Design an enzyme around this catalytic site. Structure first.
Site, PDB file in Angstrom:
ATOM      1  N   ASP A  43       4.119   0.706  -2.404  1.00 45.39           N
ATOM      2  CA  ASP A  43       4.451   1.782  -1.481  1.00 45.39           C
ATOM      3  C   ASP A  43       5.953   1.809  -1.217  1.00 45.39           C
ATOM      4  O   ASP A  43       6.604   0.765  -1.129  1.00 45.39           O
ATOM      5  CB  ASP A  43       3.687   1.606  -0.168  1.00 45.39           C
ATOM      6  N   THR A  76       7.618  11.578  -1.026  1.00 45.81           N
ATOM      7  CA  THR A  76       8.860  11.170  -0.378  1.00 45.81           C
ATOM      8  C   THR A  76       9.715  10.308  -1.298  1.00 45.81           C
ATOM      9  O   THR A  76      10.948  10.368  -1.230  1.00 45.81           O
ATOM     10  CB  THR A  76       8.555  10.414   0.915  1.00 45.81           C
ATOM     11  N   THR A  77       9.086   9.505  -2.158  1.00 49.39           N
ATOM     12  CA  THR A  77       9.850   8.668  -3.078  1.00 49.39           C
ATOM     13  C   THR A  77      10.685   9.516  -4.028  1.00 49.39           C
ATOM     14  O   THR A  77      11.847   9.193  -4.303  1.00 49.39           O
ATOM     15  CB  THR A  77       8.908   7.758  -3.867  1.00 49.39           C
ATOM     16  N   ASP A 369      -5.052  11.652   3.119  1.00 49.40           N
ATOM     17  CA  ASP A 369      -4.100  12.295   2.225  1.00 49.40           C
ATOM     18  C   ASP A 369      -4.745  13.371   1.364  1.00 49.40           C
ATOM     19  O   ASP A 369      -4.038  14.256   0.867  1.00 49.40           O
ATOM     20  CB  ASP A 369      -3.435  11.250   1.325  1.00 49.40           C
TER      21      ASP A 369
END
Length: 505
Positions: A43, A76-77, A369
């Site tokens: 993560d 987001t990564t 999610d």
């Protein structure tokens, strides 16, 4: 000397180390403290928050990622690594004796125009299609690692979010209850149409299963009240202990006889039940549970149409709680009570199963999610293919638009689009494939009259149809990614001095 050179340089180290984290393939580094806690994970949102940043300027680059956690909640990564490359490519631009005022205006112009060009590339899908909605569902679940039942549980989530699609098309994380219980395997998951309750009967003497029962809500414990001011009592006559005992039970006996005559079989009181009251409820045969969550009388009555009751004295017919079908069956372990509402269903329940308490909690997050990404497609009805298929085509689209912008500053807007090759290249490093050899053939499939859906395959390295393999994502993940990267970099490139703030953490 340049000062700014060291500022942006500090951000590259934070983005470079977390550059190979995209996807499941990729090692991870640890930052153990003086004590000790070797804990790693793929993560990205966790390693960033649990990091000892050096300079305070680096905090502004990661602060934008916190907003996407609640808005999009995914990708987001890919939003921070693309912004890091823009700073590296910007180094060559600043070396050409160009002032940042000319470069800052190029990104805003390209970013503002890129949002309008990506709309004519995305496909069109319906708000009720299952053949296409099932593929995206498996993509947001397989990322974990489980594969023994990655497709079976996917349909359970697709059929659940479909029965709660209001007219406006919004989603409320409240009517969809959640239930988990450690089982023998993950394939033991099963769909549910009604609402369950973990609170069991306080005693076994009470009835077990009652067909066609009328639920009853209550919020009033059986205890002695006390006033605010001081007021004590005095007893100095032990001969009157066995006398009033017969009258005290009458006050409580009559109170229990009201709920039975009102027209209700079971009972669910919020506050706990007194030790002496359990015998009264079991004597008449009335199911009851002690200590119920306060968030039950509000969601149950909202889904079934009941009414919260605070005082037991008043309880007319309208004050009772309706029910559809009550049943208490087993689930390969402990028994649980069921509270369905077939006459007017307004809630869905899910029974997630696993092999360990640590697995059932992870499978639950996968649904949070999944229920969020499906809503992005129902409210917009637009999705884009993954595998860098949007950036490979968008990177070549601005090439024609950049030609219209005459002048020497045209070299700035072109460098911004060239930095969009980080996604197809980052996925090739961990795979062990030369990017220079594969980034040339991808353009052939998207020359002009080619299909805009073609992309790469991380499972085999070849190039096929993304929709055929099941790799699609909503367009909002790409817009917010490039939008944040274009606006977040402004705070890093517009800097031109040093702040002498005293004590800044």
């Amino acid at each position: 000397r340049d000062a700014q050179r060291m500022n942006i340089l500090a951000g590259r180290i934070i983005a470079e180390t977390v550059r190979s984290t995209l996807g499941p393939k990729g090692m991870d580094k640890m930052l153990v403290d003086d004590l000790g806690d070797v804990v790693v994970t793929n993560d990205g949102v966790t390693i960033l928050r649990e990091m000892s940043v050096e300079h305070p300027a680096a905090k502004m680059l990661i602060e934008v990622a916190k907003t996407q956690e609640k808005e999009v909640g995914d990708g987001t990564t890919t939003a921070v690594v693309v912004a890091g490359e823009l700073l590296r490519k910007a180094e060559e631009l600043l070396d050409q004796n160009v002032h940042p005022t000319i470069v800052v205006k190029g990104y805003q112009a390209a970013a503002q125009k890129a949002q309008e060009l990506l709309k004519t590339i995305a496909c069109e899908v319906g708000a009720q299609d299952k053949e296409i909605l099932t593929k995206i569902a498996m993509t947001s679940i397989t990322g974990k690692g489980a594969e023994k039942a990655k497709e079976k549980l996917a349909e359970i989530i697709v059929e659940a979010v479909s029965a709660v699609v209001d007219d406006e098309g919004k989603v409320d994380k409240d009517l969809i209850k959640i239930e988990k219980k450690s089982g023998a395997s993950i394939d033991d998951t099963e769909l549910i149409k009604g609402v369950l309750v973990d609170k069991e009967r306080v005693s076994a003497q009470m009835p077990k299963k009652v067909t066609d029962a009328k639920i009853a809500l209550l919020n009033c414990a059986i205890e002695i009240k006390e006033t605010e001011t001081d007021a004590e009592i005095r007893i100095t006559d032990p001969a009157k202990l066995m006398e009033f005992i017969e009258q005290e039970e009458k006050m409580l006996k009559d109170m229990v006889a009201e709920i039975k005559a009102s027209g209700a079989n079971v009972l669910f009181c919020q506050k706990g039940i007194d030790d002496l009251a359990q015998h009264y409820l079991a004597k008449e045969g009335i199911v009851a549970a002690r200590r119920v969550k306060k968030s039950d009388m509000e969601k149950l009555a909202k889904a079934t149409g009941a009414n919260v009751i605070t005082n037991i004295k008043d309880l007319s017919a309208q004050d009772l709680g309706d029910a559809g079908l009550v049943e208490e069956r087993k689930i390969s372990g402990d028994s649980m009570i069921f509270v369905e509402e077939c006459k007017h269903p307004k809630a869905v329940t899910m029974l997630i199963r696993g092999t360990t308490e640590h697995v059932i909690e992870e499978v639950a997050r996968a649904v949070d999610d999944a229920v969020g990404v499906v809503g992005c497609t129902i409210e917009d009805g637009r999705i884009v293919s993954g595998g860098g298929s949007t950036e490979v085509e968008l990177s070549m689209k601005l090439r024609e638009y950049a030609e219209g912008i005459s002048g020497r500053e045209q070299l700035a807007v072109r460098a911004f689009a060239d930095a969009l090759e980080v996604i197809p290249r980052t996925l090739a490093e961990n795979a062990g494939l030369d990017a220079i050899e594969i980034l040339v053939k991808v353009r052939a499939a998207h020359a002009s009259n080619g299909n805009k859906c073609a992309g790469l395959n991380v499972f085999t390295g070849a190039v096929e149809d993304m929709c055929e393999n099941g790799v699609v994502e909503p367009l909002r993940v790409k817009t917010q990614a490039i939008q944040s990267a274009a606006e977040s970099t402004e705070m890093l490139l517009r800097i031109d001095d040093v702040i002498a703030a005293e004590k800044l953490r």
